Design a protein around this ligand. Structure first.
Ligand SMILES: [Ca+2]
Ligand SMILES: [Ca+2]
Ligand SMILES: [Ca+2]
Length: 321
């Protein structure tokens, strides 16, 4: 897609069985608990065009997903069947969708709406993980405001009732720092800038006390062989290993298989709780083989992941499974 992302867009959120307009002043901000529809009208190389992006937040329920399916069939038909359709889950957005918000980062809040509970209110202390990919696309994902949630590879924003902080990992890029600044503008708070290793007492206090967090040599490295995740499985009748692209999300770890995370200087073998013995044995064999064609191999179990592993994921919830 060569279009520059500056065409007219409309964004609706799924609320029960309806789609409901989102405040246009907040375009680029989404609730991870919800599902959205973006109708993007553009003009490129002489001709007009249309795309519908169906965006699914990582905590969106199965009924929201079914309701957007009907809602998109309705929109498609209202428009005469003219648009290009594309389904997208959180963290796997193509470049073109990321460009729609004017160089701003996509911001993803905790919470959302449901038929039962309505619109959740924002917490009074919130933490945001700001990560950008090789190509400069930036995502700011809200997580639980604990010290353990930090990782040296990224920038973070911390907003309390009384103060705001912009924490900067040793490994954080300039695109991640810029993105944190833009989140801070949307939050209407002015930051105290904080480098990793020289945090003020107020920063730790606001996170609930100082603690160990997600770090390693590789996570700390600025230079960036950026890490690769693989799914290993014998569910089809034989053992195979395929790559999982896009941002590393916790949903990508298949709980009935074994996963390999290659951070170059190390290889993690994550073992799903419903994976079979043979999947782990063969994955250990394949990792060892891949390494020797040119390094610790660390085995980790679902629910008992060390911080060196978890730091590579964009958002982690300890009560996800
Ligand atoms: Ca929801
Ligand atoms: Ca980073
Ligand atoms: Ca399996």
């Amino acid at each position: 897609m060569d279009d520059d992302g500056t065409g007219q867009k409309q964004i609706w959120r799924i609320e029960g069985s309806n789609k409901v307009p989102v405040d246009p002043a907040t375009y680029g901000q989404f609730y991870g608990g919800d599902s959205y529809i973006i109708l993007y009208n553009y003009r490129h190389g002489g001709r007009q065009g249309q795309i519908i992006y169906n965006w699914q937040g990582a905590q969106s329920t199965q009924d929201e997903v079914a309701a957007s399916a009907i809602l998109t069939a309705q929109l498609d038909e209202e428009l005469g069947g003219t648009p290009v359709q594309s389904r997208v889950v959180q963290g796997k957005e193509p470049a073109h969708l990321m460009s729609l918000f004017g160089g701003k980062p996509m911001i993803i809040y905790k919470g959302g709406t449901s038929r039962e509970g309505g619109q959740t209110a924002p917490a009074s202390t919130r933490l945001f993980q700001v990560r950008a990919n090789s190509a400069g696309a930036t995502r700011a994902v809200e997580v639980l405001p604990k010290a353990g949630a930090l990782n040296s590879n990224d920038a973070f924003v911390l907003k309390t009732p009384s103060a705001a902080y912009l924490w900067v990992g040793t490994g954080a890029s300039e695109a991640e720092k810029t993105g944190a600044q833009e989140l801070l503008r949307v939050l209407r708070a002015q930051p105290v800038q904080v480098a990793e290793g020289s945090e003020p007492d107020g920063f730790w206090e606001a996170l609930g006390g100082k603690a160990a967090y997600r770090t390693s040599p590789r996570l700390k490295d600025k230079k960036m062989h950026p890490p690769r995740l693989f799914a290993c499985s014998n569910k089809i009748g034989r053992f195979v290993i395929e790559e999982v692209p896009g941002e590393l999300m916790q949903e990508d770890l298949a709980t009935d298989d074994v996963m390999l995370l290659d951070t170059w200087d190390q290889v993690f073998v994550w073992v799903g709780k419903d994976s079979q013995e043979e999947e782990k044995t063969e994955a250990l064999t394949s990792a060892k083989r891949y390494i020797e064609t040119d390094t610790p191999i660390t085995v980790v179990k679902q629910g008992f992941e060390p911080p060196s592993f978890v730091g590579w994921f964009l958002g982690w919830d300890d009560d996800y499974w």
